[PDB]
Symmetry: D2
Subunit: 396 residues, 4 copies
């Protein structure tokens, strides 16, 4: 039939893919090639014109990567997809395609660190100015908009405390003032949140996280209107960032996304159990998780997200020293800075990634001395809880 | 010993690589991972500081890709290397790292098309201005320099007629006026030309071509001073382009470069034979090849290049129609737009990639109606010559 | 801790694996090497002796493949594992290691076809005789045993009607008569059935099916006592079959098995729903599925298997023509002969794989003209049911 | 045209390969699949019949592996090829296909060790008897032939002293007595020796060595008549050994073989230089290399081999202790037991792989205490010579 007609799990498995036309091979072939050959001068001209369709050169497009792009377009309910070398490249290819010197961007403050660095330091050096606001307060977004504003940029949920942003409301504000809304949907995946359905114009992911899910691919994806995606591909990627995805990486991501539905269900089932355990623990001062009713934006979360996610942050009694002791005491959770893998990952920003940052400047960023971030994996939740309880008990 | 002490062929094989420390595995392991795990909070902090060394996350660095970066640094006689998602990303990561709004670039006109598009249309939109000149005339480079000039950018040999640029002379000019010299060394590879040895500051490659050599990887590399490379990595790649190379791609490129020396010898031995055949053919009006004495900059070529290269361009009698007939008549050479593969590739820009471009505007670009570009592969030269003679005879 | 102490899901994720010791890489590196290097003559001698441990050559052993072997040993509760080029190679490496001319094997008749071919035609040509019996009747196993019997071989569930074999009972019989019990556990995976826990001596899998689960690897595994596995490795694999697994294949299988638990849960949840639909359909004469109470060995299934599996066979009204029409009428299920993939696969042996086999000889094999075999995938069960209902309605 | 008409280098590059029919992808796609899908019941039946052609399941055949099989068939001037999991599997799949209990094999004594183990211990246990002879003496082959002899098996050149076997002469003897001649051509590759052209019936390789050439693939290949290969595939591989090659491994081998011609030229050019150096060294008692005129079968070598090969063995003054000191003193050559890689590999069997073997029993095998085996790589020969001279000087 048409792949956009089936159920979401069916789409996860089938969308964008079909048996190879030449051989019937079920798995999408890995077209690990740079070069494509033309049958005639005319065929080469047709493709190039670009009157006609077909492949030319992997930087421009590739059959393996095309399958991934089409699948994610289907999953996000967008027109077209564009794969990239990294989540960062997805974000910068998008914004550098849309903006030029003199343009303006309104961005959430609570965003991925490397994204913040790009917006804070790199963009202004190209004459593109950025205003940072608390996107949990839609009025601050409105107030920051200028005649030059081309884009409003948000993440939800957001690090490090998993605060939310009302996508539908922000979309309405952005659009009334003539701007596009770009949403980083990395944390949720299309299985749990669909920003385009809520009015966003463009969605970006680091597929490095849940979409691939297996901790072995760095990559990104952009989904949006065909007209925009074509510009992101034939100008942004081709000319500006050069951030194309390797066919092998696309193939692995296609392979990983096959289990997206069942992975997200288990990630979130596990996370809710662990979140409730942490909330009941007298040594834990705070637990940040959209699935707990005490979450400041709980009802918004229930309307906007189909599941509360696989990520939890929490504060351990005793601040920095307690946090360091705790992470040094886990036996199962692994100390690392990524998320959305099949293994449970844990990190303590104050002692690990922000040790040199001013204590008072971290607090401003929302990073307290006792804040721990946990990416819940596919292990038995009882084992993860036991490991956490063991480490917490020791640390406090 | 120290890898920088051995002969060039030995370096090609060994530099940057050694048996795996844990297992003794001879082949560089494919570290196809996103995540790296820390032993303690302290270890994570050390690496991040960045007081100490080790890995963190593949976008930042990876053991497989590091081996490739170190090898190419050795081969180009530079301090450090940085691998990228594509040749384009190597160029743009470099220039976007070096330049900001208000800055200026002097560039050769005879450059790779996509590079031209970036410099012509994208750079100016970021407030970075570019002046194009004929780099075969070093005085035009000097005359175009401004107080704001940060970079002089050149390719040699250059498309489509394989004209040359005097690297040593241009380096001297750039440096006297306080600018850096960036050279795209894709066409030659470090086996045939070493721009850093001639005064260039930074070298970029599309490894998609000869360095990989097997037509199955899109990738780039940047080589230069440690101080610059660190900025290209921790700002340019990390924040701006996001154009990181997949570990699998790095592994394939490491594998391909093992045979770089013997491949270049055969490519060039074959090309010289074919070039001489073409020069003797009464149906061929011109042959462009650095190995022919009639080449305008022949002596410069002999001083600057150890071999004349594997690329040949030539003009067939009868212009566009003849060129189209010829390429449609080959049986062995493959119609495609890449180069530096093991297979012989052929293309006729006027009928294939520039069919819609104004005939008189192509002529300005140096693209005549009868111009054919040939990437000579590893086949028996007698077979390639027979195929060419067959197609030429038919076309004329 | 010790990996054998955690919950089964935790083991699925972690067992046999750990971060790379040299770099901390979380993903098991792909040690795609043939050669391993020694530090000294002495080190080479030690490993070879084989006094000491370490690697030598990938045919003998490899770090990537070792991780897989250790994981599956843990999952099956066996001492050691040995990976192979295919499921067939797992079976033949095992049996050719155990048996020699003059030896005897008692085997189930209801086994994988290619296994049957090996036992029926190849074994006897090496002087190794085989008696086939109905293994659903343990007394037939006993009656067929001879002084020369070395091995009893069974599959459960078995094609094509998913009949069962009482592993514990057969193990007792085999052992009393001094024979080993070998069980092919491919259909269930260690998540659903553990033959070693029930008395079997050796377990074999085609990992091509559920263990890999992604339809992109041909491979096998053998699990058993260390003493046996060492012989299977250093004689059976090394000298006889040469059926070693590629490190890349082992890496993919490690990647696939990460989701084994959640995949099996969904496969079986989906299959039960589809099985019940089929049982309610007036156009379907029979449905063969361990999860239906009408199954001849239902109670045995409940004791021996934790889930009823993802495979269903059924007979459609109207025999051969109806079966052909049905499979030619599906739009979602894919016509193919493998199983345990994420996509739903369907096949009709009478018109597809046994068309030339004598109708009356197929009936003997249990293959009726209307028999359809279905491998239930991860799609929405409602979509699969709709596709089946559509095709059945058309066919009848 | 027809690939069998071009020059050998052209064949190396092109034979068995063409651009992908669906997309034009130049690189052979990696068809990393287990499953193949049929368009209809009829199509599945046709393929299975096996009336018609196409793919079914990777163990039986695969598009990537087919390309490799066709290429090597062309290079060896044989009808058909069959890829395998290892060199060992190529040999055993062949012999177990041809022989059954009561059959007999005449084999050279000077053969690969693991092959010897199979023939010495495993074959007889299947009722297949083997007589070992000195194949450098064709009369011993004749004298050992029995009415039951099905196969004569030889390697040339042979370990450890690189003695030769007269293929044409042995072929004539085998054929007159009604037997097949099987030749292991691993050491030479089709670029240097073509046993089928000299009368052999079947050729086997470990592609692990020169054919792949990059030290990252374990694999084998069999080349011979279509009638035989079909049996090796549909019985030997399918039923007996299960030793199929992974599509990824086939793709890597296809990639490696692209440079076979230029690699062999350099390997042999380097080896001849090193062999002459060793022959001139007063600390070296003997040098075994087909390229030295002092070689016992020099003239036979010149007729049978196009190049003398990349392998050298030699004896160092001072026996075992000297040999151990020497290999422990090299800085560039790597201590390892494989050959045909791009890196120079060295080994000293008496102290490394045969330390526990009886000194007098090694001598019988032709392994003297001072015997060193060297696999010459692609490094600068001057660097290898300097490393050897350094280590030899120290050791003596
Ligand atoms: C720059 C290190 C990567 C951080 C990581 N991407 C995370 O936030 O999960
Ligand atoms: C944009 C198509 C690629 C052109 C190709 N990189 C070449 O000039 O060889
Ligand atoms: C010989 C074709 C493969 C059959 C397939 N292994 C299945 O029974 O699922
Ligand atoms: C059993 C170790 C492998 C020996 C190796 N294949 C060689 O002779 O080169």
């Amino acid at each position: 039939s048409d792949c956009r007609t089936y159920g979401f799990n069916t789409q996860i498995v089938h969308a964008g893919q079909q048996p190879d036309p030449s051989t019937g091979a079920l798995s999408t072939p890995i077209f690990q090639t740079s070069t494509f050959v033309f049958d005639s001068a005319e065929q080469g001209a047709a493709r190039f014109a670009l009157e006609e369709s077909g492949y030319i050169y992997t930087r421009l497009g590739n059959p393996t990567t095309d399958a991934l792009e089409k699948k994610l377009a289907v999953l996000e309910r967008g027109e077209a997809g564009l794969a990239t070398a990294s989540g960062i490249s997805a974000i910068t290819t998008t914004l550098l395609t849309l903006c030029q010197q003199g343009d303006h961007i309104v961005s959430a403050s609570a965003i991925y660190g490397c994204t913040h660095a790009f917006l804070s330091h790199s963009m202004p050096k190209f004459g593109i100015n950025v205003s940072f606001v608390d996107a949990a307060k839609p009025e601050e977004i409105r107030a920051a908009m200028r005649p030059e504003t081309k884009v409003v940029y948000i993440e939800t949920p957001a690090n490090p405390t998993l605060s939310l942003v009302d996508i539908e409301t922000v979309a309405g504000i952005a659009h009334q003032q003539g701007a596009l809304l770009v949403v980083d949907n990395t944390f949720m995946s299309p299985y749990c949140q669909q920003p385009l359905q809520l009015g966003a114009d463009i969605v970006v992911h680091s597929v490095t996280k849940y979409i691939n899910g297996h901790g072995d691919v760095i990559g990104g994806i952009i989904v949006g209107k065909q007209e925009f995606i074509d510009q992101a591909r034939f100008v942004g990627l081709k000319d500006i960032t050069g951030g194309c995805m390797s066919p092998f990486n696309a193939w692995l991501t296609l392979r990983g996304v096959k289990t997206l539905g069942i992975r997200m269900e288990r990630h979130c089932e596990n996370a809710l159990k662990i979140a409730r355990f942490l909330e009941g623990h007298p040594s834990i001062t705070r637990v940040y998780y959209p699935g707990l009713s005490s979450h400041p934006q709980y009802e918004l979360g229930q309307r906007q997200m189909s599941l509360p996610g696989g990520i939890i942050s929490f504060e351990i009694a005793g601040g920095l020293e307690a946090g360091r002791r705790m992470i040094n005491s886990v036996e199962l959770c692994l100390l690392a800075v990524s998320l959305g893998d099949t293994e449970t990952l844990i990190q303590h920003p104050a002692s690990m990634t922000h040790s040199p940052v001013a204590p008072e400047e971290r607090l401003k960023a929302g990073i307290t001395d006792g804040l721990i971030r946990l990416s819940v994996g596919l292990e038995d939740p009882e084992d993860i809880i036991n490991d956490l309880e063991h480490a917490i008990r020791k640390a406090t």
